[PDB]
């Protein structure tokens, strides 16, 4: 259906020696497709999906210059922000930034975003209108006043509504074999006695894509929230995801409980029973 | 902002069959973190990890992984240290989770 | 395709 492209940048200062560590990752939906790591040997933006490997040498040169430029801007900003927050030169600090766009089923622009954080707290974010800034505190307010005067939001709006969506459309086309394919969860239930009179039922969803899923238990056709445990969705390490939900039940009453699985890859929600 | 930890196998475990042991660390800040995979209390050498990324609330996540063969006797675990933790946190691998 | 002023 709808799709997204997102870049995640992290800069971490190294007060003991040298320049900050800079890491950049790009995603299309739940698929990582590019990376840059200032500690890696290449000093280049690298491919991480087969469908991007086809891009010309100019694509790789431009992407490399862009992330190396941001890494230097982040290094300057770490110094500026240390001053804003009246911090010492001895501690390690972090700047993170995420930006991207969402397109609908027809490829049209839906939403754009560009937000950043200092030491894991919101600093400055482009509002949904892509015209103005939300500053979380007085240090971010100093940045907002400088950026309001310098057409910064206009440049982000032009990129998010243009370049961002055009490249996302190309990636979705080139990587359609995987990016536009859903992997339905492979589901199964396991049984684990907790005593001679109680047992845990655990409903598994494996090897699915995209990561969004809903796993719920019902007892006699109504939602069961008591005695349940739902783990956070986790990566399998092969590009797919995993999740399980469990409930403790009295032995002999297992048939009252049904697990319900909702995923984009399933035309109709799935129902499992022990 | 302490790390949340899940230790699990890529594939449903079968004793004697090659698989991948995963340690998913998430919800933590700052990004500096020590993650080791253990076999019978000892650090496994050939451990790789994912490229640093983060969630909406800015908390970081990483996947550490290595190939392994589950068996009847071998005990596997993940050992995590981070600035928010007083001592290293050890989470044992249980094939049922 | 990746893409900015100083803070
Ligand atoms: Mg049965
Ligand atoms: Mg998130
Ligand atoms: Mg064995």
Author numbering:
A (entry chain A): 1 to 274
B (entry chain B): 3 to 99
C (entry chain C): 1 to 3, 9 to 12
Question: Which sentences did the original study use to describe this structure?
Answer:
CD8+ T cells recognize virus-derived peptides in the context of human leukocyte antigen (HLA) class I molecules via their T cell receptors (TCRs) to specifically eliminate virus-infected cells. Conversely, two independent studies associated the HLA-A*68:01 allele, which is expressed at 5.2–25% allele frequency, with severe influenza disease during the 2009 influenza pandemic. To understand CD8+ T cell responses in the context of the high risk HLA-A*68:01 molecule, we have recently identified a novel extended 12 amino acid influenza-derived peptide from the virus nucleoprotein (NP145–156; DATYQRTRALVR) with the capacity to bind to HLA-A*68:0118. Here, we provide an in-depth analysis of influenza virus-specific CD8+ T cells directed against the extended 12 aa NP145 peptide restricted by the risk HLA-A*68:01 molecule.
The flexible nature of the NP145 peptide might potentially present a challenge for TCR engagement, thereby limiting the recruitment of A68/NP145-specific CD8+ T cells during influenza virus infection. We observed that the P2-Ala is well-accommodated within the antigen-binding cleft of HLA-A*68:01, and that the long peptide is highly mobile as previously observed for other HLA-A*68:01-restricted peptides. This is in accordance with a previously solved binary structure of HLA-A*68:01 and a 9 aa NP91–99 peptide showing that the HLA-A*68:01-bound peptide was highly flexible, thus allowing the binding of overlapping peptides of different lengths but of conserved residues located at P2 and PΩ53.
